[PDB]
Structures are given as structure tokens and as C-alpha cells.
Assembly symmetry: C2
Homo-oligomer: 341 residues x 2
């Protein structure tokens, strides 16, 4: 029931963001929600090339760091690398099959494309600071701490993908497969979509932002500056991605786009809240590990933890969730010099 | 059984291109096949923004055209729009979920991304030459002739997607779904993938080049040079897209990748052959519609038909197939200028 070109003539301005008729014609002269076209344009105006950034002095900087500083750095790098591996493919594989408006379709492909460039930038850094990048790359997959910090990201995507396949193959219903009853419900699939979006919004809004705080800590010190320039270009793209997820979520709950989606959202608020908090907690628990055999100079477990709280509150308010934490002003205003967005 | 982040630590240098373990880590320090890394680098090096191309004059030029030349121009643009509309999403939705090596995975995401830029370029041309793009765009879906020429593109893709879903959900075997037997054979899915690919190769290498010809015809009479700059940029990218499909196809047949794939390529050859013949006849048939209200000095069903046979033979030979048409010199050598 999924089609690469639906032959029905339809008003693309009247479809919902998700679950309506798959997009046929790709046109950009008009949009239901212009935010998406605006986001495609800015992201294209931001196009950059990693290799164009000189990281030649980062190797010695890294060599000269203290062992626990190498640890904090490399470790944070491995996490950023993991998130972008996932983000390079997921939005395409997970969302494309469910989008019903063209501007949203292309924004998703552009967004995913910008993420592959981030991944290439990490190969650029890694290749220039270590002797055998393979060590770093292998560690990303099995590293217990990161599977830990990043736990449940791949799973929200995976289940949504699975459910979408059943929905496209069998459609709404109670069916049977190899002696098992399999129930397919649109509403539960819309809930799966909603929660997956929420989780990608936290990935973009928080998980990535926390990593920036670590990278920029080195930059503040004039250390690993090739990495810093690259991370600055990345945070600028991240700002657009988060705008995109905020808008999709806000349009969904507001009921304007899909009445049923607004109901689903509302009824799942506490579920939504807990994930957000759960996510903040993961980032804190990791700030823990990273700082235990030693603590960086200008950042530490407590400062990072305060930062996790501060941004989390900002992000949750943005999509109408309650503030889980104590209100406080930014603990590391020096970060602003690097977050040009 | 499809996963966005496979937790097994695998030597990505040893996976087949497709059907292996899904890619986890996206690294570009090494490649099983460096041709894909090279296409990624070249494509990124060619990054361009349509709206920056000056199409200002094209509106006068267009208004000045005889209605039949207008018909010919627009009907062409419309098919072009259609092919990039499908190519923008297709490679991601059909291929991504089956790729098992990082370079090819990112190559496909980069290729698709470049097609959405092609589509942006048509919206830029259309809005700068007509009063309501909506007529043109609404005319694409329902245009039977358009639809007739494109027949079978969306279908190969959609069927491959459905089988892939069954594969991911049930795994190989014969299963019982809603009281019916469904068979999921990997060999079979691999055949569907292989033919999809062959079909995409023909889409990139033959269907698009015929459209360029028609596009460039105007440019030779010094008309619609805004559209020509864009078509030239597009042509530049399509050449990378076709080099990517040819390699994928040739690598699979060489038996250097998945061996089973090399026997499928051999067993399917007549099918590969027949699909090119059909696409070719489809392109010839279009001519009857393009030239509805008349031809133009230098471009007619006749020249179109010969160009079709000409390029088809070159593309089939590139993937090791027999040439169905008579050999002949390029019937429109002035095209090479714009092609490079
Ligand atoms: Fe990223
Ligand atoms: Fe991002
Ligand atoms: Fe294209
Ligand atoms: Fe192409
Ligand atoms: Hg998601
Ligand atoms: Hg998700
Ligand atoms: Hg950090
Ligand atoms: Hg740090
Ligand atoms: Hg941090
Ligand atoms: Hg929720
Ligand atoms: Hg919510
Ligand atoms: Hg949430
Ligand atoms: Hg905290
Ligand atoms: Hg294909
Ligand atoms: Hg195909
Ligand atoms: Hg043509
Ligand atoms: Hg032509
Ligand atoms: Hg073949
Ligand atoms: Hg074949
Ligand atoms: Hg002919
Ligand atoms: O990002
Ligand atoms: O194209
Ligand atoms: O193309």
C-alpha cells in the first residue's frame, strides 16, 4: 500500500503531514507549512565540506592531553559519531514511507543528507588524530557505556519501521501470521510515530547539545581547534533540525493537522515526559563515567549535569511538557560563543 | 529484522553490497569499493543551487515560442519533473533498507539528495515561465501520455519494497498470512533487486538523455538558455548516477560480491535485455505525443527514434548486454557540446 508515485490527483495542501496519500509530484512553489521549505533553504545555504577544515594541529593537541582528557574527548567523539550514523539513515528509512506532504518529504531527505556530512566530518577528525581509526570505529558499536548513554534510540525507530511495514502490507485489522494473531491499528502506529519524533527531538535538542558542551570546553582552551570548527558547523545544522522536530511536534499536538494525533499526544503526555527525563538522566549518568578516572579542566560532572538540566527544561517547555527541573540561568554562558545559532 | 543500528561488531569490508548485515557505523576511512566514495566526493564537489541560476529571459523566450514548440518544451519538462520526483524518494525508500556497506549507503543518500535538487530546479524553471505552476504540476499525475511513457518505474520500486517488507518481517520460507501462503525466497528478492537496479540504470542512462536532447534543441536555436544551464548541471549529475548503477550492476555480475548474485545476473539476462527494449520503445512512442501539434526544424520523431537507438546500444554494451539496434553514428553530435 506504499507507492513511489501515487496516481491519484490530490491536493497536497490538504493532506496531513503523515499517513495521508504518499507524495507523488515533488513541487516547491507552494506549501501547507512553509517552515519546511524555509528549513530546506537554510540548510542548503549552510552546505559545508569537512575536508575544507584544517585539523592538522589537533593530533598533537590530542597527544599532549592527559590520559583522562584523551578519554573524555575521544569518548564524547564516539558518542557524537554514533548519533550521526543513526541520524544519517533513520529519518529516511523511518519517516519517508509515512510522509504525505512534499515540503516535509524533501526536508527529511535534506536533513538526513546533512547528517551524512556530519558523519564524514567525524571520519575526517578521527583520521587526523589517531594512528588507526579502526580502533575508534570498532569501539562505537560495542562500547557498553555508549550503548548505555544511547540506549533506546534505535529501538524507537526499529519498532516504528516494523509496525509501518505491517500497516503497509496488511492494513488496519486483526490478522494471523503463522498461527499468531497480529493486530494492526492506525492509532497505535500514530502513537509510535509521535513517540519516535519526541525521542528524535530530544536527541537533537539535548543529547547532541550536551556533547557540544564537552567539545567546546577544549576549544575554550585553544585545544583541538580543527574539531571545534567542525563542531561549530554541526551545531548550526542541529539548530535547524531541532526547529524541524519542534514544529512537527507542535503541529501534531495542536490538533490542526490531525485531530487524532492531538488526542494521542495529550493522552501520552506523562509517557512523553518520562522519556525526556529518562533521556536527561542518561546524559548525566554518562557525564559521570567520562569524569571518573579524571576531570577535565573547565568542565566536570557537576557543571555538565547543571547544563543537562538547564537545556532540558528549555527543550521540554518548547514542546509543552512540564519542567522537570529547578529553573536556573545557563551554567556555561561561555558556550554561546560557539553556538552561533 | 531490519535495524537502524545493528549491534554486532562486523567487518564491513566483508559484507556484500546488499542483503548483508545492515550498516551500523558510518565510517569513510576505508571501503570495500572505493568507486562509491569517489562518487560521493564528486557529487558533493558538484553541489549547486538552482534558484541561483538566471532564468529571467526564459519567460520572454517561452512566450515567443510557437504554441507547438511550447507544447514540446513543456511536455518534456513535465516528464523530467516526474522522473526526478520519483528519483528523489525512491533510492532511499527502496535501496537503503537493503544496503550492507557504508560507502554505498551514503552514495545512495547523496544520489537521492541530488535528485531533490533536480526537482527544486524544475519548480524554479516552471514558476519563472508560466502563470500557474499548478497547471503544469497537476498535469503530470493525470497525463496519460506522460504516464504511458513512465509505465513500470513506480511498479518495479513498489514491488521491491513490498517483498523487502515481507522479508524483513517474516524472514525466508513459506508462511501463512491471513489463511494464504506467502513465500519469501531471498533468491527471489535478490532478483527483484537486480532488475530494479537494471531498470534504474535505464532510467538514468536512457530516459533522461532523451529528455536532455529535446531540452538542448532549444538551446541550439539560442532559446531558453536559463533552462539549458540547469539541464547542463543536471546532466553533470546524471552521469555520476549512471556510473553508480553500472558499477553496481557490473560488480554484482563479476561474482566478486555475492556469488548468488552473479548467477542471478546470468540467469536473468534476457529479462535485463527485454527491459531495455521496452524502455526504448516507450521513449520512441512518446514522440507521437511530443510532436502532436508539429515538430521543429531539427527535432522530430525521426531524429528522436534514431537517438534512442543510438544511446540504448551504448548503455546496453556498458553493462555487457547484446545490442538490439543497428549501429550508427550519433544522429545529433551537436549534443556533445552540452554534455561534455
Ligand atoms: Fe548531526
Ligand atoms: Fe541533526
Ligand atoms: Fe535527476
Ligand atoms: Fe539521476
Ligand atoms: Hg523518529
Ligand atoms: Hg525515533
Ligand atoms: Hg560531554
Ligand atoms: Hg569535555
Ligand atoms: Hg558536557
Ligand atoms: Hg507521548
Ligand atoms: Hg506530549
Ligand atoms: Hg518525550
Ligand atoms: Hg543532571
Ligand atoms: Hg531500483
Ligand atoms: Hg526500480
Ligand atoms: Hg524528448
Ligand atoms: Hg529528444
Ligand atoms: Hg543482465
Ligand atoms: Hg536481469
Ligand atoms: Hg529509429
Ligand atoms: O545534527
Ligand atoms: O535528472
Ligand atoms: O539525474
Amino acid at each position: 500500500a506504499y507507492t513511489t508515485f501515487s496516481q491519484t490527483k490530490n491536493d497536497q495542501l490538504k493532506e496531513p503531514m503523515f499517513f495521508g496519500q504518499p507524495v507523488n509530484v515533488a513541487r516547491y512553489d507552494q506549501q501547507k507549512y512553509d517552515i519546511f521549505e524555509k528549513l530546506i533553504e537554510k540548510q542548503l545555504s549552510f552546505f559545508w565540506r569537512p575536508e575544507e577544515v584544517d585539523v592538522s594541529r589537533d593530533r598533537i593537541d590530542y597527544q599532549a592531553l592527559p590520559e583522562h582528557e584523551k578519554h573524555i574527548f575521544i569518548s564524547n567523539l564516539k558518542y557524537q559519531t554514533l548519533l550521526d550514523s543513526i541520524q544519517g539513515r533513520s529519518p529516511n528509512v523511518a519517516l519517508l514511507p509515512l510522509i504525505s506532504i512534499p515540503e516535509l518529504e524533501t526536508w527529511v531527505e535534506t536533513w538526513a543528507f546533512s547528517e551524512t556530512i556530519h558523519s564524514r566530518s567525524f571520519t575526517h577528525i578521527i583520521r587526523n588524530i589517531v594512528n588507526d581509526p579502526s580502533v575508534v570505529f570498532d569501539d562505537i558499536v560495542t562500547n557498553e557505556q555508549i550503548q548505555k548513554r544511547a540506549e533506546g534510540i534505535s529501538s524507537y525507530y526499529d519498532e516504528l519501521i516494523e509496525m509501518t511495514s505491517y500497516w503497509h502490507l496488511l492494513g488496519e485489522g486483526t490478522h494471523t501470521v503463522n498461527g499468531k494473531t497480529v493486530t494492526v491499528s492506525l492509532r497505535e502506529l500514530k502513537k509510535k510515530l509521535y513517540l519516535c519524533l519526541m525521542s528524535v527531538n530530544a536527541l537533537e535538542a539535548i543529547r547532541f547539545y550536551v556533547s557540544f558542551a564537552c567539545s567546546f570546553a577544549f576549544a575554550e582552551r585553544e585545544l583541538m581547534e580543527g574539531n571545534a570548527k567542525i563542531i561549530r558547523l554541526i551545531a548550526r545544522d542541529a539548530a535547524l533540525h531541532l526547529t524541524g522536530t519542534q514544529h512537527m511536534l507542535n503541529l501534531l499536538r495542536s490538533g490542526a493537522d490531525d485531530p487524532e494525533m492531538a488526542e494521542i499526544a495529550e493522552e501520552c503526555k506523562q509517557e512523553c515526559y518520562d522519556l525526556f527525563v529518562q533521556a536527561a538522566q542518561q546524559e548525566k549518568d554518562w557525564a559521570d563515567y567520562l569524569f571518573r578516572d579524571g576531570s577535565m579542566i573547565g568542565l566536570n560532572k557537576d557543571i555538565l549535569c547543571q547544563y543537562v538540566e538547564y537545556i532540558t527544561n528549555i527543550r521540554m517547555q518548547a514542546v509543552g511538557l512540564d519542567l522537570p527541573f529547578q529553573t536556573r540561568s545557563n551554567p556555561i554562558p561561555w558556550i554561546n560563543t560557539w553556538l552561533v545559532s
